[PDB]
Amino acid sequence: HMQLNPESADLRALAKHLYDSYIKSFPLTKAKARAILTGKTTDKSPFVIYDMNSLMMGEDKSKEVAIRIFQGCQFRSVEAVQEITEYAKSIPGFVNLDLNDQVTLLKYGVHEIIYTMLASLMNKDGVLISEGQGFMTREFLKSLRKPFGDFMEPKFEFAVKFNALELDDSDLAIFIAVIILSGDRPGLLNVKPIEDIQDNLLQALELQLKLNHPESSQLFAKLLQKMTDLRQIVTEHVQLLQVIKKTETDLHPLLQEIY
Amino acid sequence: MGLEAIIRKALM
Ligand SMILES: *c1ccc(C(=O)NCc2ccccc2)cc1C(=O)Nc1ccccc1
């Protein structure tokens, strides 16, 4: 029997703390993304990039289109890493970890969290871009010449399955915190402090999913199983990043100034 | 290397 006791109440307070920080860190939420995608918002209707002519017009509303699109992907990922890091600072205990362990956690976690949260902005048709100002079709991205054509497609394949779980921002805030505090990342100095925070976040996540999803009794287990899909996504992603570095040309301004 | 730079800056 689940009881609303001091321990559970504290787990609900930890869930709310993360939700609030999530809202502050992440400009476009799943609630707002889904409103846009289903046409249930009063906000400005996104511009749809579905062919080469709608890309050209969209770049208003590199000589090579595929490269320009990859360039925008790259700059967006720098921005996303900054937002995830701000979020990570809000997770109780995280900034109190050794700074090298904080860095290691984010360096191995950010890609998993990027594709988790990009699914909130995705459907079978495409993905919201420019904080919901544009919509780029999955088939238009698939049409880009090798090796760019197959770059986003595995993230769509993940996302239509992931979205079927019908997680909401309250669920995702805790899920992402669980990803960040993974004690199994290579090169971690002090593992037990990370495991202890992860254990508290796993308790909070399990309780979140029991209260919020009465019709999937094992959603908690299903979500933990999604971490293998994410690891594979990131393994395959990193392989494609290399092939693009070996075989193409293109830095974000922040990166240029850091040197 | 590039990823780590951005993370370290953002934590400060
Ligand atoms: C698009 C292109 C490249 C990358 C990426 O992982 N680049 C490696 C890198 C190196 C240093 C710092 C950051 C990243 C990612 C993407 C991508 O997924 N972009 C994105 C992210 C969130 C939402 C939409 C698009």
CA distance to A41, A58, A249, A251, per residue, from A46 (Å): 11, 10, 30, 28
* CB contact set of A8 (below 8 Å; sequence gap of 6+): A2, A207
- Residue A118, SS3? helix
Domain map (residue ranges) of chain A: 1-259
* Residue pointed to by tokens 């990039």: A49
Question: What tokens does A203 get?
Answer: 């308790």
Distance from CA of A55 to the nearest CA of B (A): 29
Contact A216, A39 (CB under 8 A): no
Start-end of H helices in A144-190: 153-163, 169-180
Contact A87, A26 (CB under 8 A): yes
Residue A50's φ and ψ, nearest 5 degrees, are -125, -5
Amino acid at A67: I
Q: Return the ligand 1 atom nearest residue A78 CA.
A: 13
CB of A254 within 6 A of ligand 1: the answer is no
Rounded CA-CA distance B3/A238 in Å is: 12
Handedness of CA A236, A129, A220, A213 (dihedral sign): negative
Q: Is A130 annotated as ligand-binding?
A: no
Q: Given in angstroms, what resolution was this structure solved at?
A: 1.9
Q: Return the ligand 1 atom nearest residue A155 CA.
A: 18
Rounded CA-CA distance A91/A85 in Å is: 10
B chain contacts of residue A85, beta-carbon cutoff 8 Å: 7, 10-11
Contact A135, A46 (CB under 8 A): yes
* Residue pointed to by tokens 């290691």: A104
CA distance to A109, A156, A208, A217, A224, per residue, from A19 (Å): 19, 25, 11, 22, 19
Task: Report the residue of B1, B3, B4 to disrupt the A interface, i.e. the one with the largest count of A CBs within 10 Å.
Answer: B3
CA distance to A81, A106, A252, A253, per residue, from A256 (Å): 16, 21, 7, 5
* Residue pointed to by tokens 């497609």: A153
Ligand 1 pocket: which of A29, A69, A73, A242 to mutate (most atoms within 8 A of CB)? A73
Closest C-alpha to ligand 1, atom 12: B3
- Residue A145, SS3? coil
CA closest to A74 among chain B residues: B3
Contact A188, A104 (CB under 8 A): yes
A chain contacts of residue B1, beta-carbon cutoff 8 Å: none
* CB contact set of A169 (below 8 Å; sequence gap of 6+): A19, A22, A23, A29, A30, A31, A120
CB of B3 within 6 A of ligand 1: the answer is yes
Determine the angle formed by the axes of helices A99-118 and A153-163, rounding to 10 degrees: 80
What experimental approach yielded this model?
X-ray
Distance from CA of B12 to the nearest CA of A (A): 10
